[PDB]
DNA sequence: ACTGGGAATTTCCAGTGA
DNA sequence: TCACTGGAAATTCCCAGT
């Protein structure tokens, strides 16, 4: 048998909570979750239905998949991992109360010591390779299912990793959002100054991206024009056609080059320009 | 009796208090008339004496009674949170060019005060009874304590003199008010033009945009929701007091913190006819 | 008592003309 | 050169709702 993730955790929009905040850490939703239809991380065991247990732990985003210093917290969680029975009547299993508690950088050494001490090392990475820097803004769920073989002896299935879950404090992997803009039209010749307020970005990894059918262009600005990570002053690019006879609607959105993430699009109208 | 005169006060706004985690030294407090080209420092004049002696500089609370402050003075000739060095025999004017303010953490407050008492750092000899209540950790005064000599070499302690307050720039309610950028610096005299203003950190509950001219006063229109992450304000210009006008008129536009009535440097705004 | 989110408090870091 | 100078990040706190 083998494990399959049929509903991944939602990657973005969750804040990892510190122990000091004293509020567990909420519940990781499923990828296709909404207010109307709430869903949770779900696995399917293929080739087995019957008694079994599951451990869910946190490992690093990148290989080797070392145990992460952060902790899973919530019901049936101890020492930073979840452990409980699977229903023997079903092959599909969901997990409704998985929260992520982030450890402080000062307590990192201690946390890793606990991971080893509690035999929380799903990929059996050597301690020598567990030195080196951790990305404390990203984790993967690691599902470790133990079933029974036909003879009725405990059988540990191969561990399966989720997609990365990202702390929403980290701007490099956060959702891009335009909050406020002072101007949503301009000359087809470009060069109109626009003030844009956004959620926190990194000034060296941000673009303003204009698009239409078979057309793309970028706003003009320097790193100096990004104010405290939450405001961009830029100049509009020229439109493809400099001799517009009537307004043309295009999309404007934030773009993060590193992962090619996009904000929700926003309507911008290029206008005819008689003369300057 | 000789006495101490402060001929160059410290600059009140603009400088961060530094934590111990940031380093041993915490820069140097500039003088109020420092302008980078002309880089000045706090300086005192000792009227009616010149010769050997000592000068101690300590931090006291902004408001009376001037209790010793939990924060520490750090830098050259500093120890146990105060500056102490030999007075220059030759000159009667004395500059202090490496005074840094190291802020203690809120949880180490009781420890800090204990050190002040233990080191006899209490210029105004305030009873320990009064050293328990609330400290303003965002503001301090320098206290200049000069000891000179009589003709026989007896120490004579001159009256201690206080500086103007120095405010932590990293703290939200005592930071320097600064307009960094605006989308436009002119509009109609009828008002209602939308301004996007980028600024240094403000508190949305304690900020306004203050328009002023020769015998006129008005305020930018916005709600707390219009302050974006403490560093930007979207507001509507007020009407000028002349809806006709005819010819352009210039006015000042400033950030204002109502709590302490502080103002940013003024930015020029031009009202236009129609 | 458990969360969603803004900000206060404390820590870290890149560059800076030298 | 590297002790400063601001910008960014990490950690803690708090209010306002269920």
Curated annotation (Swiss-Prot), chain A:
Record carries keyword Acetylation: yes
One GO biological-process annotation of the entry reads:
cellular response to hydrogen peroxide
Q: Where are the Phosphoserine residues found in this chain?
A: 258, 263
Recite the UniProt keywords alphabetically.
Acetylation, Activator, Cytoplasm, DNA-binding, Isopeptide bond, Methylation, Nucleus, Phosphoprotein, S-nitrosylation, Transcription, Transcription regulation, Ubl conjugation
Residues the record lists as S-nitrosocysteine modifications: 20
| Protein modification | Ubiquitinated by MKRN2, leading to its proteasomal degradation. Degradation is required for termination of NF-kappa-B response. Polyubiquitinated via 'Lys-29'-linked ubiquitin; leading to lysosomal degradation. Phosphorylation at Ser-258 by RPS6KA4 and RPS6KA5 promotes its transactivation and transcriptional activities.
In chain numbering, cross-link Glycyl lysine isopeptide (Lys-Gly) (interchain with G-Cter in SUMO3) is at 19, 104-105
Molecular-function GO term, any one: DNA-binding transcription factor activity, RNA polymerase II-specific
**For the modification Phosphothreonine, which residues carry it?**
158, 236
Q: Where in the cell is it found?
A: Nucleus; Cytoplasm
Q: Deletion: any effect?
A: RELA haploinsufficient mice show cutaneous ulceration, epidermal skin loss and a predominance of neutrophils and macrophages in the dermis and hypodermis in response to TNF treatment.
Q: Domain RHD, which positions?
A: 1-276
Induction of its expression: Induced in myocardial tissue by lipopolysaccharide-induced myocarditis.
Q: Which residues carry this modification: N6-acetyllysine?
A: 104-105, 200, 203
Its tissue distribution reads:
Expressed in the myocardium (at protein level).
Purpose of the protein? NF-kappa-B is a pleiotropic transcription factor present in almost all cell types and is the endpoint of a series of signal transduction events that are initiated by a vast array of stimuli related to many biological processes such as inflammation, immunity, differentiation, cell growth, tumorigenesis and apoptosis. NF-kappa-B is a homo- or heterodimeric complex formed by the Rel-like domain-containing proteins RELA/p65, RELB, NFKB1/p105, NFKB1/p50, REL and NFKB2/p52. The heterodimeric RELA-NFKB1 complex appears to be most abundant one.
Q: How does it assemble?
A: Component of the NF-kappa-B p65-p50 complex. Component of the NF-kappa-B p65-c-Rel complex. Homodimer; component of the NF-kappa-B p65-p65 complex. Component of the NF-kappa-B p65-p52 complex. May interact with ETHE1. Binds TLE5 and TLE1. Interacts with TP53BP2. Binds to and is phosphorylated by the activated form of either RPS6KA4 or RPS6KA5. Interacts with ING4 and this interaction may be indirect. Interacts with CARM1, USP48 and UNC5CL. Interacts with IRAK1BP1. Interacts with NFKBIA. Interacts with GSK3B. Interacts with NFKBIB. Interacts with NFKBIE. Interacts with NFKBIZ.
Q: What is known of its domains?
A: The transcriptional activation domain 3/TA3 does not participate in the direct transcriptional activity of RELA but is involved in the control by RELA of the accessibility of target gene promoters. Mediates interaction with ZBTB7A. The transcriptional activation domain 1/TA1 and the transcriptional activation domain 2/TA2 have direct transcriptional activation properties. The 9aaTAD motif found within the transcriptional activation domain 2 is a conserved motif present in a large number of transcription factors that is required for their transcriptional transactivation activity.
Protein name as it appears in the record? Transcription factor p65
Range covered out of full length = 19 to 294 of 549
């Amino acid at each position: 048998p083998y494990v399959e993730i049929i509903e991944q955790p939602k990657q973005r929009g969750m804040r990892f909570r510190y122990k000091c905040e004293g509020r567990s850490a909420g519940s990781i939703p499923g990828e296709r979750s909404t207010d109307t239809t709430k869903t949770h991380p779900t696995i399917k065991i293929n080739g087995y239905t019957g008694p079994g247990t599951v451990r869910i732990s946190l490992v690093t985003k990148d290989p080797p998949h070392r145990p992460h210093p952060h902790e899973l917290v919530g019901k049936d969680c101890r020492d930073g991992y979840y452990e409980a029975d699977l229903c023997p009547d079903r092959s599909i299993h969901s997990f409704q109360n998985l929260g992520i508690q982030c450890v402080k950088k000062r307590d990192l050494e201690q946390a890793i010591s606990q991971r080893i001490q509690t035999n929380n090392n799903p990929f059996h990475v050597p301690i020598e390779e567990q030195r080196g820097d951790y990305d404390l803004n990203a984790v993967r769920l690691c599902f470790q299912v133990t079933v029974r073989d036909p003879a009725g002896r405990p059988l540990l299935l191969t561990p399966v990793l989720s997609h990365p879950i990202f702390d929403n404090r980290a701007p490099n992997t956060a959702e891009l959002k335009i909050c406020r803009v002072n101007r949503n039209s301009g000359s087809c010749l470009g060069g109109d100054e626009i003030f844009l307020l956004c959620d926190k970005v990194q000034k060296e990894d941000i673009e303003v991206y204009f698009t239409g059918p078979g057309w793309e262009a970028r706003g003009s600005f320097s790193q100096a024009d990004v104010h405290r990570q939450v405001a961009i002053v830029f100049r509009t690019p020229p439109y493809a056609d400099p001799s517009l006879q009537a307004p043309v609607r295009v999309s404007m959105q934030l773009r993060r080059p590193s992962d090619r993430e996009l904000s929700e699009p926003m309507e911008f109208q290029y206008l005819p320009d008689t003369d300057d």
